[PDB]
Amino acid sequence: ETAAAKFERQHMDSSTSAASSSNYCNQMMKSRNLTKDRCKPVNTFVHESLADVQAVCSQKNVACKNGQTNCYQSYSTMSITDCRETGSSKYPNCAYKTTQANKHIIVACEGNPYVPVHFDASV
């Protein structure tokens, strides 16, 4: 698996009229193989098109949380879903709270072609 492919598996779920149910994160964290080794504490899925998310690599250059300079913030807000592990959640039955939002995303980009490889933040 390439880094670009990993970003698509971990963070992309393109859909118009995204309506993530209370069960969404429970299903998606499992189906995208994010609960195989351990319960991943937090994750974000983006519902805009791949073209639109890839386009962010040419948008607003911002500092990455880790101090690197290869992060970019979207000029427009994007439909997203946040997944946050619950208190009662016990591996291998990882449990999540599902919260829909409309926010600017920040991603790190690398390579040729210059594409997203890391989801940094939503703002």
Task: Report whether 65 belongs to an annotated binding site.
Answer: yes
Q: For residue 29, what are the domain limits?
A: 1-123
Q: Which of 1, 3, 2 is nearest to 108 (CA)?
A: 3
Query: Does residue 47 have an active-site annotation?
Result: no
The DSSP result for the chain, as a single string, is --HHHHHHHHHB---TT----TTHHHHHHHHTTSSSSS--SEEEEE-S-HHHHHGGGGSEEE--TTS-S-EEE-SS-EEEEEEEE-SS-BTTB--EEEEEEEE-EEEEEETTTTEEEEEEEE-
Contacts of residue 76, Cβ cutoff 8 Å, sequence gap at least 6: 104
Query: Does residue 118 have an active-site annotation?
Result: yes
Task: Report whether 66 belongs to an annotated binding site.
Answer: no
Q: What are the backbone angles phi and psi of residue 100, rounded to the nearest 5°?
A: -80, 145
Active-site entry in 8, 11, 83, 104: 11
Task: Report whether 6 belongs to an annotated binding site.
Answer: yes
Number of domains the chain is built from: 1
CATH code (residue 98): 3.10.130.10
Contacts of residue 15, Cβ cutoff 8 Å, sequence gap at least 6: 47
Which method was used? X-ray
Order of strands, sheet of 78-85, starting from the edge strand that comes earlier in the sequence: 42-46, 78-85, 96-103
Active-site entry in 32, 47, 104, 118: 118
Task: Report whether 30 belongs to an annotated binding site.
Answer: no
